[PDB]
Write a protein that binds this ligand. Structure first.
Ligand SMILES: [Mg+2]
Lengths: 576, 456, 576, 99
DNA sequence: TAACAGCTCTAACAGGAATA
RNA sequence: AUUCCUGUUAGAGCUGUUAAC
DNA sequence: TAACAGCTCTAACAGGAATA
RNA sequence: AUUCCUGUUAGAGCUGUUAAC
């Protein structure tokens, strides 16, 4: 059974689903696994008799692990990761002292090293929002239970073997959500973790689980068999006529590495008439997030704790401009709402198709798709005939900043509109390089008075500079002053970015003048750049950057006209 | 509406030197006081070795002699300080190799270079090192020289000789200072001498200088990637570097891989959690098990939801995490006014949006001018006329732009491989990128972690 | 022992403090008390034997309660609120069926009617933030298991009679916080609630009470005795070296109504050398509220759940002004930062003293206490000699709105400053009534051209009106048009309030012209009031309310001058 | 307010020792008993319901060389239900070094 | 606890009648 | 008190800000 | 999955040297 | 590759917005 099918199956019927999590989920919560736990005991055992400093060797070192394992093999102990080893080393270290064994197992799996991860904060959410009712976890850790306390703020009813009859009663009275530990909490005398204790099953829990099986279908994850008592309980549990209406999916992280016991149990279950399926869903943590992703109408209150990254942190406010102040190149566009034109097409259209129609027709208007057009209707009639046009109406953009941030098409459209507006009534030529727009001094009109201030900006030692011309050592390359103008969405504001550049008349032959572009820009220091930016502000706006609110409209003689207003003074902020 | 939030200029970070003296100018402090790690005897003496073809060994011994004797700065005299001689400035003798500590590259290297085979050339250069291998005790550092005739194999597609050599000799524990003719013939001499000498001291021993005012309880993490152009698609090899000041005096700067295949430079939940787990386990090993209290994860690209969730779930609640993204290319650029002759003071951070700030890692630096004291200095004056700031887009934090901005500024000044005053990016990002290049060139390096002195 | 000394005593040493919550605290949690349970049982049984509709008659009715109690007394049952009644009615209704008894007690005290109040949440916060480590409460339903889990976000280890030896181990290994129920959860069969079960104590729990006695001191609340087993455990508990190290205060809501067993018990402890004290602190909720109030450095994360009212809800944002629009009387003061003067006094001063100094000296400046003065230094030198003045410096108010909102002295000072500024250069007279400032047309200069528009405002059918004069039927009362001007702090903004009024020249003789004030104001409808407000705006500002940003400074010829800027157009907002 | 150091000088510390006795298990080294005052001190500390919960451990350099009173007290404590033990280790300083 | 600032309320009176 | 809330004359209640005790 | 828009990065080259 | 990052020429990666399949 494929993994996508498992997610669909767990979503169609998620209201009747027991979970079974034994020692596999604890790996990812920061809790040492049983394999790691064996090494911790071996480390203590070796350091104890052979008097060695505990600080001197770290157990996850390869050399120290090999040395300790060689020592263990020297005394005839089991060789490597073999059965009857974990219980063997426990009973060796603690020499049949179940109180000290319990205390150590509590300290190793204590509730201070546990850090819940998304897979854990998803199962508890499923418990609270009441899709899964029974979770049998063969883990003695205080997590999934801690996860429920964190996510909902309530107390979860955990059932250790210390009571051991509450689960049979609780499932029957439907006081969900139940979390019955088949091996019980470590806070109690009986832990049932050694191999001799792992051959028997508690009579009443056997019952709790059987009741759960008839009522729900089982999903077992992070479980690799190797336990005889749980395997025989599951085998008996299938014996029941309606064992899992919802089918049992054993989610292994890897089907290839799954033990043969799981596969033969699945085959036996299929032979007994149930629809048990084995699926490979990678890690439990990855799987839980996908199951949660497919969950519909998840409450916001619990989802604010399930996925803490979903909520937006670091909303740290900025201080006031009170009390040297950098002067950036950002002109704030205080326009909040604009009007655009919409055309309805009888057939669906593609933004590429509209772009090629722009290239062919070359109208005196702007258009984009989302089809929002800015300009005159007759231009659109030239672009689109009456047959393909259903209606032409109006569009209002109440929040320009949110609109451009949401859709990049709106960003490009508004950038093109403001660029056309700024260069509508001025002699400065408008070009494009890649996806950016450049306002460049024209070659012929370089002697204008409105450029003279710019001529002062580039001048050396206060004399008259040059604005346009030919490269010193180029055959045909022509150069001019220019400004790259862009639209930047910052927070909830829109700004115009101006950057002084040296435009080259041939587009593809810009690199041949690189040295010149370098040479002309070697000494454009803070004062010179300040002067050039002021001159460009004056050219583009017509007013000096003091207390100005110049307003510019694109296509003023058109029915659909956009009227922007940009402060003539660039952004500044005095130091604190 | 044109009045933005008030900025504050973080002052130039102080650098811990010989006898715990602090000076924000690295080279001036090195001449005046000496290396921070020279307080203890980590390098007893800098014993060198040469690996070059027989024809060009004279260049190696000549440059070593130049390191021995003092030199004066010719270019960029605004910042640089007169060399005082290796023995005087680093307080440790620089030992010229004897006959047996001075190897000769095989003549088959020339044939391979003429054949234009980078892999075989790197293999032959490494195989030439066996004579030095026996006396591995004999030579602390090795100055590998490459003649210009090998240029055809220096850099071409799907290959880089420097990274291949570094990855081949990193598991063999011998530091290597590659020398090209490029810096063998460079006009200014104090430039090359300062750079090579500080690199030699760092690779033989370590810690030429250490950043002061560093809380021992913060571990700084930087992720950076590189691209291997596969025939069918691409491979995004990302690696993570870590810096921290441990309880011991030896400031630590390491890097490591992140593992299989990645099609995008964004780590998934499991990979981010695994990398972060390795990071704080390394910190705990270097801090006798003490949990870090502040974690800074600098990434060149934005953290997805999976990365932020992995960060949140890998640590406990006691360790607040400062997930910050660094943007290099930005549209904004500033100009200081009182308009100033020199650009805006370095380190000014300007809060633009509740989560996005401008940091001026580039800019004028005060108090480090040699001639005409009191005049500001712009490190990148030759390259650019104005400083281009970077954007810090905080993805997770509790409060305080100053806390992360000052940390980034101090992390921009501890690149011992960098000859100049500072770096545009924190050392975490630059070392993660260098190791990403190394791993992309040699994929069989993901097993081990390495100190900075191997790859700087 | 007075309650305040007990609070200091606890606050002095709350690190080592066991709590002993009885069934009284759960009284507020909304759970039915013991008497409520008894009345439910009688009503449940009375309706069945005598076939009566269950929902037809309620239980908290006085008549039905009396009828049911009379029926119960008819069959010879115990009379009224007497011992061996609660257990008697339980054993009568359930005829020795402990499973059904447990199920009913679970349903009555289930975890759906419980709504945590301040007391349980505060105790759970004390548990999490680790001041109190042991909470033994003779209750049943998990009011705290829930509440500490909700505020801390972490699961709580509850101990009961099903295991009952967990508490001693957890105490010995310092696995705090522990919450040991001396009578156990209802999910578990051991409930220990009938009188025959209430004579014995579990050996391991009883053992725990004595070991915990030495470690901490006990605070017992919501407990009224009447239990023999708990009383004898405490007496045994009292009978040990340093049984209560910090002492045990048996807190009761009322000392007068306390049972003699407690007072007998308190007197008994004192004879055994311990410092046990009985105090009255009101209800459990108020006690814990005060205890939390005295808690220092409470974490913000848990306190955001302890007191949900402390955080500010209902921060519902307001929409945009998009798309009839009311025109209010509020002029927005866009000034954000102002400069003031500060004088340092060699001796402390009182705001009343400064007010009387103002009354006597009558300077040409403003002063307030916080001493911030606005005006010229020589005026302050007239008010205060050099001997009493230490230094004179400057003060900056970066956020005017927050400053006036925080301190009402700042509100009054800024209101007076803006009033003086607005009437600085104008002939309109400035008066005060109560604490409201009035700008009134002067009697002599009523023929000014700047009043003619106002003359148009009051005119009838477009003719010329009257602005100042004498009342129709008053001996000496004189009347004029006026505007009450005030400062209003709204959110993060400051506004000027203008209200048209009819000023009367004698202050105390305003009522005699009331009819006239009524008669003149009978027909000042929306159009007329609009005209008067526009005329008053023109008079006070000199510019019509279109796109104006008139700026006014008070004491422009003074070193300390306040420069405010108020938009000339009143607040407006188009309908959505 | 730990850490606490108190010398018996053998009832001022007797109440404190009994209070200490319930809180944590005690280990006694370098003492052979032979003093009736501390003997009755410890015997009185044993009686309570939860006395020396972790255990009472007697560490002498040699088990057979210890005075009979120590073994008598150990047997009495074991009979009372406490988990007192008599373990043989080396010299007190060597024992603490190995710990 | 004694003043002082504002915001808002009720407690006693009085009081005239729906764009003229 | 068939109603309505418009004013007048007062006092409190909360917040505060100081000085204390 | 196929285009299209923006934001940002690296991958190869080239390239000159700190306010003149 | 003693260094630095300034540009050029390209491609990807993410987001999106449509059309689908
Ligand atoms: Mg190097």
């Amino acid at each position: 059974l494929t993994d996508n099918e498992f997610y669909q199956h767990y979503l169609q019927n998620s209201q009747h689903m027991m979970w079974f999590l034994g020692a596999g989920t604890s790996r990812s919560a920061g809790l040492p696994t049983a394999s790691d736990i064996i090494w911790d005991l071996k480390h203590r055992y070796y350091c104890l008799h052979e008097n060695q400093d505990y600080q001197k060797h770290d157990i996850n070192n390869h050399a120290i692990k090999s040395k300790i394992q060689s020592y263990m093999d020297s005394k005839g102990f089991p060789l490597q990761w073999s059965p009857e080893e974990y219980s063997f080393y426990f009973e060796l270290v603690f020499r049949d002292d179940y109180e000290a064994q319990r205390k150590y197992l509590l300290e190793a799996l204590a509730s201070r090293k546990v850090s819940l991860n998304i897979g854990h904060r998803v199962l508890a959410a499923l418990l609270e929002m009441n899709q899964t009712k029974v979770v049998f976890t063969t883990n003695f850790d205080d997590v999934i239970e801690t996860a429920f306390s964190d996510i909902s703020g309530k107390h979860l009813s955990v059932y250790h073997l210390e009571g051991s009859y509450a689960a049979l009663s609780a499932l029957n009275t439907e006081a969900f959500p139940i979390y019955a530990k088949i091996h019980g909490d470590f806070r109690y005398q009986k832990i049932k973790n050694l191999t001799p204790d792992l051959q028997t099953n508690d009579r009443e829990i056997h019952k709790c689980f059987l009741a759960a099986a008839i009522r729900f279908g089982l999903v077992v994850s992070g479980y690799s068999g190797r336990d005889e008592n749980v395997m025989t309980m599951l085998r008996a549990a299938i014996d029941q006529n309606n064992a899992f209406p919802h089918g049992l999916y054993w989610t292994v992280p890897s089907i290839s590495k799954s033990e043969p016991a799981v596969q033969d149990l699945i085959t036996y279950a299929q032979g007994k008439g149930v629809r048990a399926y084995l699926v490979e869903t990678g890690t439990f943590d990855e799987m839980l997030s996908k199951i949660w992703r497919q969950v519909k109408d998840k409450p916001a209150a619990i989802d604010a704790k399930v996925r803490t990254a979903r909520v937006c942190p670091v909303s740290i406010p900025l201080p006031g401009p009170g009390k040297p102040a950098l002067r950036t190149n950002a002109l704030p566009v205080v326009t909040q709402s604009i009007r655009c034109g919409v055309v309805t097409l009888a057939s669906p259209i593609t933004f590429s198709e509209l772009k090629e129609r722009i290239s062919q027709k070359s109208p005196k208007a702007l258009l984009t798709y989302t089809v929002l057009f800015l300009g005159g209707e007759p231009e659109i009639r030239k672009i689109f005939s009456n047959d393909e046009i259903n209606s032409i109406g109006q569009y209002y953009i109440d929040e320009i900043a949110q609109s451009v941030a949401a859709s990049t098409f709106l960003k490009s459209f508004v950038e093109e509109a403001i660029l056309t507006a700024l260069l509508r009534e001025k002699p400065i030529l408008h070009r494009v390089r890649h996806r950016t727009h450049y306002a460049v001094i024209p070659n012929a009109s370089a002697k204008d008075d409105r450029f003279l201030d710019l001529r002062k900006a580039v001048g050396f030692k206060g004399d008259l500079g040059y604005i346009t011309g030919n490269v010193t050592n180029a055959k045909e390359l022509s150069w001019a002053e220019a400004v790259s103008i862009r639209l930047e969405e910052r927070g909830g504001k829109l700004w115009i970015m101006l950057k002084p550049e040296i435009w080259i008349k041939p587009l593809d032959r810009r690199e041949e003048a690189t040295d010149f572009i370098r040479s002309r820009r070697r000494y454009r220091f803070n004062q010179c750049s300040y002067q050039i930016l002021d001159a460009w502000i004056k050219i583009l706006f017509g007013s000096i950057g003091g207390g100005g609110t110049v307003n510019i409209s694109c296509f003023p003689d058109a029915e659909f006209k956009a009227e922007f207003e940009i402060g003539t003074r660039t952004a500044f902020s005095l130091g604190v | 509406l044109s009045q933005l939030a008030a900025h504050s200029t973080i002052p130039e970070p102080l650098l811990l030197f010989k006898d715990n003296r602090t000076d924000t100018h690295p080279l001036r402090g090195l001449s005046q006081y000496g290396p921070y790690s020279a307080c203890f005897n980590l390098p007893g003496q800098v014993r060198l070795a040469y690996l070059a073809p027989t024809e060009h060994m004279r260049k190696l011994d000549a440059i070593v002699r130049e390191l021995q004797n003092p030199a004066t700065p010719k270019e960029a005299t605004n910042y640089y300080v007169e060399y005082g001689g290796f023995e005087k400035v680093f307080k440790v003798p620089l030992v010229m190799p004897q006959e047996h500590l001075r190897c000769l590259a095989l003549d088959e290297c020339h044939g391979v270079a003429a054949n234009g085979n980078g892999l075989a050339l790197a293999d032959k250069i490494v195989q030439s090192m066996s004579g030095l291998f026996r006396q591995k005790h004999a030579f602390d550092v090795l100055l590998v020289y490459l003649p210009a005739s090998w240029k055809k194999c220096f850099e071409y597609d799907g290959f880089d000789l420097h990274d291949r050599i570094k990855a081949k000799v990193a598991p063999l524990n011998l530091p290597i200072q590659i020398i090209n003719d490029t810096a063998l013939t460079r006009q200014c001499r104090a430039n090359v001498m300062w750079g090579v000498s500080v690199a030699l001291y760092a690779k033989a021993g370590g810690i030429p200088w250490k950043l002061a005012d560093w809380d021992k309880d913060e571990a700084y993490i930087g992720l950076s990637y590189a691209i291997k152009k596969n025939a069918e698609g691409q491979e995004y090899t990302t690696c993570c570097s870590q810096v921290f000041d441990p309880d011991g005096t030896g400031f630590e700067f390491v890097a490591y891989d992140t593992r299989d295949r990645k099609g995008n430079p964004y780590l998934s939940y499991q990979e981010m959690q695994s990398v972060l787990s390795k990071s704080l386990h390394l910190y705990q090993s270097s801090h006798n098990g003490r949990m870090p209290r502040k974690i800074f994860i600098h990434k060149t690209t934005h953290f997805t939801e999976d990365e932020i969730q992995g960060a949140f779930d890998s640590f406990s609640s006691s360790t607040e995490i400062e997930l910050v993204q660094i943007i290099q290319s930005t549209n904004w650029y500033g100009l200081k006014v009182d308009p100033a002759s020199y650009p805006v003071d370095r380190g000014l951070y300007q809060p633009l949006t509740e989560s996005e700030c401008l940091l001026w890692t580039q800019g004028s630096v005060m108090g480090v001018n040699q001639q005409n004291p009191g005049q500001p200095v712009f490190k990148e004056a030759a390259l650019t006329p104005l400083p281009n700031p970077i954007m810090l887009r905080r993805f997770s934090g509790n409060g305080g732009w100053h806390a992360t901005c000052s940390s980034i500024l101090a992390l921009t000044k501890v690149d011992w491989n960098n000859n100049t005053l500072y770096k545009k990016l924190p050392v975490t990002l630059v070392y993660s990128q260098v190791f990403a290049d190394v791993v992309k060139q040699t994929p069989e390096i993901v097993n081990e972690i390495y100190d900075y002195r191997f790859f700087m």
